[PDB]
Amino acid sequence: KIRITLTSTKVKQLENVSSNIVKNAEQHNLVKKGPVRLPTKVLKISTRKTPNGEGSKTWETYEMRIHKRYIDLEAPVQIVKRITQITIEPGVDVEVV
Amino acid sequence: GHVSQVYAIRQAIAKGLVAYHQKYVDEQSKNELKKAFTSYDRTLLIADSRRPEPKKFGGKGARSRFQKSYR
Amino acid sequence: SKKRKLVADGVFYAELNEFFTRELAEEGYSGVEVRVTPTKTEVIIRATRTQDVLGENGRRINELTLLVQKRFKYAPGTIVLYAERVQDRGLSAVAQAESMKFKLLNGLAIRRAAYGVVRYVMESGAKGCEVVVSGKLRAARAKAMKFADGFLIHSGQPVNDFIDTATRHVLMRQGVLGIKVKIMRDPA
Amino acid sequence: RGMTSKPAGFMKKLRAAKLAAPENEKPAPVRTHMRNMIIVPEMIGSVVGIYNGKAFNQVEIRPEMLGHYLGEFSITYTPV
Amino acid sequence: CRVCSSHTGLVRKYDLNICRQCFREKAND
Amino acid sequence: RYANKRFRKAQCPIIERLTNSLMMNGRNNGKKLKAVRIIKHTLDIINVLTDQNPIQVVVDAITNTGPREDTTRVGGGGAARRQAVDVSPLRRVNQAIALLTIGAREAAFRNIKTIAETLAEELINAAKGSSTSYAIKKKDELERVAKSNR
RNA sequence: AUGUGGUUUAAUUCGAAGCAACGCGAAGAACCUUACCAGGCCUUGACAUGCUAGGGAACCCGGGUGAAAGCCUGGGGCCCUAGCACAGGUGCUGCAUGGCCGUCGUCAGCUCGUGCCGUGAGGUGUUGGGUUAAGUCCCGCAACGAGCGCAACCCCCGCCGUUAGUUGCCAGCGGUUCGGCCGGGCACUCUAACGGGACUGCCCGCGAAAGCGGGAGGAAGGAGGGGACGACGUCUGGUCAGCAUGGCCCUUACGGCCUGGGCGACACACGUGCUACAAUGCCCACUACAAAGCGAUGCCACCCGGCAACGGGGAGCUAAUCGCAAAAAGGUGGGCCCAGUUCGGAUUGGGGUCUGCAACCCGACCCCAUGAAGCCGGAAUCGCUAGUAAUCGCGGAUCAGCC
């Protein structure tokens, strides 16, 4: 039951990335759940532009929508092998349970 | 809230009525329940996009602006 | 990255950039991209003169890369050091700016130095370019200088300009004078 | 009014006041910003000047006075 | 904060920047 | 002026637009519900005390309340004379409804948990069946002012 | 309540000053913070590499004076001194500056090229008529076009669909410790990626045209709502007190530590606010709909002791799966009956909880008693054009606690 969480700013960067992981693991584990979408949350943050330091007076508003993708892979085995070396795109941050 | 729900339900019953039959739902949604040139009769068919409204700075409410005085 | 040490992970990058800018100046710094996974950070410094960076037969690249490890211990993790050549330094706003900033330090006619830079940039590629000099021109009363050619128009307007921007400072006995270089390239 | 089980008192004056205790008392005052402190008996007899924010007011503290804050003794607002 | 050392108001997470200013500054380029 | 006239959804009980307008006049703080209730309860009040159907009573009230002529100030060569003038049909309604609610609020009688009786009594008092009450006074007073300075 | 003027004070640290200073820097003043005041204390120096010379040289424990620093000194047993090379100051100057910010102003302008007019500076274009949020567009014209700007291209919110389903729900069936908990199911909500949709496109009216008015459909319109994008410049605008930095000034101190006081003073003046003067209301009870947020010694379920604040105990959560949380206005039933009142809660007496070394000066909270002014506000004056104003409650940053 290896839950994989793939998050990224770009929708494509994930579709590519998460898709790769689906195909690879297909080789040494169960058959993956398939890239599940998980809705995209947008965060609006109004804060000091910089951290405590210069221009505490500064502000600004930011909106950063972030995308997610689970594609769970139950019954693990040499999934790890196909996954470990295989990754590509930067712009993606993946963390696994 | 109960008010919001009243609107959502109102829309629901408006939409379902259309699926059952195109004919019944008329002008707001389909024909008479359905649509118009400009002003909305009831325009039950539309989903009121209105949302609370963010508070803009420099203004108390969002829209509401502080009044001026002789000061 | 990690909630706990995203900041820590970040501080290091500044640390790395700190040395590179100090050392690599002669080389002609343009940008320092930093990619990372675990204890193996990328750092691919871009330079006009890759030679200056590398050293002879790669002797300098060794020292610097080694210097990096001192700062980046095992905890930061060993890091590599890729270097790519900048095709046409003339295109890099950072360089173009630095280029002018240096001449100003020399005490060259600023207005002319500006024309030349716009010309060089304009001369090789670039759909449009513009250079801006701060004040205290010729150690004179603070002023501002301009110069531009080609459509910076269709740039400045955010819509996919792809305008490289760069600022370069210039310490001087008289005082600091900022330099701005804008280069317009094919839009998206 | 009981703040908690242990009465708080900042150490700046305490450590200072008590040292005076073995010699005896200290003539002249003391001066501490720490109006926040509660006064303890060792304080008695002493004269601690408290900070209005403007200045330090001489407050002789007597026994009836102990449970108090010290700040209670130095009023911040003046009619002036 | 960490870089500029402006104490006045640095976010903890970055724990950097002069304050919001450098945070915004670094972000800007 | 303020904006284009927005059309108002007719009243749920009696699908009369004018009624909704009246209700809007009553409401404050967007408490649309309390506002509707007060008007409805008043209508019930109109039913018991008076044999007539409330809808008719109200409409008649507004009619008595609408000013035909109003005086507006204007600067002539000397002093600002108050020129008498007709009132728009749109304007007359807003004034009538507004004046009713105000006069209604004016009434001493505090009946029903809310205002509802004052509205009920006010409307009847307005009717010209009974053309009295504070609302009508203002109306009569304005007209009187006009044509005074004919 | 709060900021300011002023006055007062040992000091009430500093700055900000018409719009664009005054709930402003302060998104957290009891000590701290803290820059002020009182008192105790600390010169090769609080830090760097080094020189000549006399001297005790590692080090460990006391006393005198003191606010502390420091100074003097007793003394078990690398370092001091003399001469030499060489930190700290929120102390002044924002008219020496960087940076950043406010502002006119989200406002409609500023120009070029060629042509044409003029001896020339320059003009024409960019003016005129209609229209627009707009130098926006239309018609006109010795002008014809163009560049920066406007608009558009980008982001968030409105409606629909495809893809994806560990979010979601019996929608739909079987079970239940009846918690969507279990199997199951992607429909729905949702999550995030992409696609559609609005263009005065269609209908009637006026117009030369742009377009103005009106109507239908539609979630939505005639720029649908909010951002990014605030131009060249103006104010010798604001900040050396965030930081940076030229120059000037202080170095037993214009530095540093500490305890205490002050920034919380008041005869008064003003700004911004809160609560309210009540019946479209107040109180008690019962009962119903939300969003966006935050949680490690942190949110605190539930149980117990207390009228209560809160204390004791303790589950889960590591947070779409647990907690903050109750939503308030609202609906239902009762009380009040027009009174300074079951309005209104100032002020004051007493008891007490909690944080914190410590709540006199000078914390918040609870319970009893007290129960003020206030019955709608002079001259004058402020906000807002729709999901806006008005009204109701909820969260957060700072943060021990909290004004």
Curated annotation (Swiss-Prot), chain A:
| Cysteine disulfide partners in this protein | none
Q: Where in the cell is it found?
A: Cytoplasm
The keyword Protein transport is assigned to this record: no
One cellular component term (GO) for this entry is: cytoplasm
> What residue intervals traverse the membrane?
none
Cross-link Glycyl lysine isopeptide (Lys-Gly) (interchain with G-Cter in ubiquitin) position reads 1, 12, 81
User: How is the protein modified post-translationally, according to the record?
Assistant: N-terminally acetylated by acetyltransferase NatA. Also partially acetylated by NatC.
Could you state a single Gene Ontology molecular function term?
Answer: structural constituent of ribosome
Biological processes, Gene Ontology terms: cytoplasmic translation; maturation of SSU-rRNA from tricistronic rRNA transcript (SSU-rRNA, 5.8S rRNA, LSU-rRNA)
The alphabetical list of record keywords is: Acetylation, Cytoplasm, Isopeptide bond, Ribonucleoprotein, Ribosomal protein, Ubl conjugation
The family annotation for this protein states:
Belongs to the universal ribosomal protein uS10 family.
Protein name stated in the entry: Small ribosomal subunit protein uS10
Look up and give the organism this protein is from: Saccharomyces cerevisiae (strain ATCC 204508 / S288c)
| Source lineage | Eukaryota, Fungi, Dikarya, Ascomycota, Saccharomycotina
Q: Which residues of the full protein are shown?
A: 21 to 118 of 121
Curated annotation (Swiss-Prot), chain C:
Q: Which positions fall inside the KH type-2 domain?
A: 16-87
- Chain positions found as Phosphoserine: 92, 124
Provide the GO biological process annotations. cytoplasmic translation; maintenance of translational fidelity; nonfunctional rRNA decay; ribosomal small subunit export from nucleus; ribosomal subunit export from nucleus
Which domain of life does the UniProt lineage start with? Eukaryota
Localisation: Cytoplasm
Give the Phosphothreonine positions (modified residues): 39, 65
Does Nuclease count among this protein's keywords? no
Residue numbers of Omega-N-methylarginine PTMs: 141
GO cellular component terms attached to this protein's record: 90S preribosome; cytoplasm; cytosol; cytosolic small ribosomal subunit; nucleus; preribosome, small subunit precursor
> Position(s) of the covalent cross-link Glycyl lysine isopeptide (Lys-Gly) (interchain with G-Cter in ubiquitin)?
101, 127, 136, 146
The protein's UniProt keywords, in alphabetical order, are: Cytoplasm, Isopeptide bond, Methylation, Phosphoprotein, Ribonucleoprotein, Ribosomal protein, RNA-binding, Ubl conjugation
Give any GO molecular function from the UniProt entry.
structural constituent of ribosome
Q: What is its main location?
A: cytoplasm
- Per the record's keyword annotation, is Protease included, yes or no? no
Q: Which family does it belong to?
A: Belongs to the universal ribosomal protein uS3 family.
Quaternary structure, per UniProt, is: Component of the small ribosomal subunit (SSU). Mature yeast ribosomes consist of a small (40S) and a large (60S) subunit. The 40S small subunit contains 1 molecule of ribosomal RNA (18S rRNA) and 33 different proteins (encoded by 57 genes). The large 60S subunit contains 3 rRNA molecules (25S, 5.8S and 5S rRNA) and 46 different proteins (encoded by 81 genes).
What other note does the entry give for this protein?
Answer: Present with 146000 molecules/cell in log phase SD medium.
Q: What is this protein called?
A: Small ribosomal subunit protein uS3
Which organism's genome codes for this protein?
Answer: Saccharomyces cerevisiae (strain ATCC 204508 / S288c)
**Which residues of the complete protein does this chain represent?**
6 to 193 of 240
From Swiss-Prot, chain E:
Q: Which cofactor does it need?
A: Zn(2+)
Q: What is its main location?
A: cytoplasm
What this protein is reported to do is described as:
Component of the ribosome, a large ribonucleoprotein complex responsible for the synthesis of proteins in the cell. The small ribosomal subunit (SSU) binds messenger RNAs (mRNAs) and translates the encoded message by selecting cognate aminoacyl-transfer RNA (tRNA) molecules. The large subunit (LSU) contains the ribosomal catalytic site termed the peptidyl transferase center (PTC), which catalyzes the formation of peptide bonds, thereby polymerizing the amino acids delivered by tRNAs into a polypeptide chain.
| Similarity annotation | Belongs to the universal ribosomal protein uS14 family.
Q: Which residues of the full protein are shown?
A: 21 to 49 of 56
Any additional notes?
Answer: Present with 5410 molecules/cell in log phase SD medium. There are 2 genes for uS14 in yeast.
Q: Which UniProt keywords apply?
A: Cytoplasm, Metal-binding, Phosphoprotein, Ribonucleoprotein, Ribosomal protein, Zinc
Q: Please give a single GO biological process term from the UniProt record.
A: cytoplasmic translation
Q: How does it assemble?
A: Component of the small ribosomal subunit (SSU). Mature yeast ribosomes consist of a small (40S) and a large (60S) subunit. The 40S small subunit contains 1 molecule of ribosomal RNA (18S rRNA) and 33 different proteins (encoded by 57 genes). The large 60S subunit contains 3 rRNA molecules (25S, 5.8S and 5S rRNA) and 46 different proteins (encoded by 81 genes).
Give the protein name, as stated in the record: Small ribosomal subunit protein uS14B
Positions carrying Phosphoserine are 5
Keyword check for Ribonucleoprotein, yes or no. yes
Q: How is the cofactor bound?
A: Binds 1 zinc ion per subunit.
Q: Where in the cell is it found?
A: Cytoplasm
Q: Coiled coil where? A: none
Q: What's a GO cellular component annotated to this UniProt protein?
A: cytosol
Swiss-Prot record, chain F:
User: What's noted about post-translational modification?
Assistant: N-terminally acetylated by acetyltransferase NatA.
Q: What does the record note on quaternary structure?
A: Component of the small ribosomal subunit (SSU). Mature yeast ribosomes consist of a small (40S) and a large (60S) subunit. The 40S small subunit contains 1 molecule of ribosomal RNA (18S rRNA) and 33 different proteins (encoded by 57 genes). The large 60S subunit contains 3 rRNA molecules (25S, 5.8S and 5S rRNA) and 46 different proteins (encoded by 81 genes).
GO MF, one term, reads: rRNA binding
**What is this protein's record name?**
Small ribosomal subunit protein uS7
What organism does the record attribute this protein to? Answer: Saccharomyces cerevisiae (strain ATCC 204508 / S288c) (Baker's yeast)
Single Gene Ontology BP term? maturation of SSU-rRNA
Q: Which family does it belong to?
A: Belongs to the universal ribosomal protein uS7 family.
Glycyl lysine isopeptide (Lys-Gly) (interchain with G-Cter in ubiquitin), cross-linked positions: 128
Q: Disulfide bonds, which pairs? A: none
One GO cellular component, as annotated = cytosol
Where is this chain's protein located in or outside the cell?
A: Cytoplasm
Q: What the protein does?
A: Component of the ribosome, a large ribonucleoprotein complex responsible for the synthesis of proteins in the cell. The small ribosomal subunit (SSU) binds messenger RNAs (mRNAs) and translates the encoded message by selecting cognate aminoacyl-transfer RNA (tRNA) molecules. The large subunit (LSU) contains the ribosomal catalytic site termed the peptidyl transferase center (PTC), which catalyzes the formation of peptide bonds, thereby polymerizing the amino acids delivered by tRNAs into a polypeptide chain.
List the keywords (alphabetical): Acetylation, Cytoplasm, Isopeptide bond, Phosphoprotein, Ribonucleoprotein, Ribosomal protein, Ubl conjugation
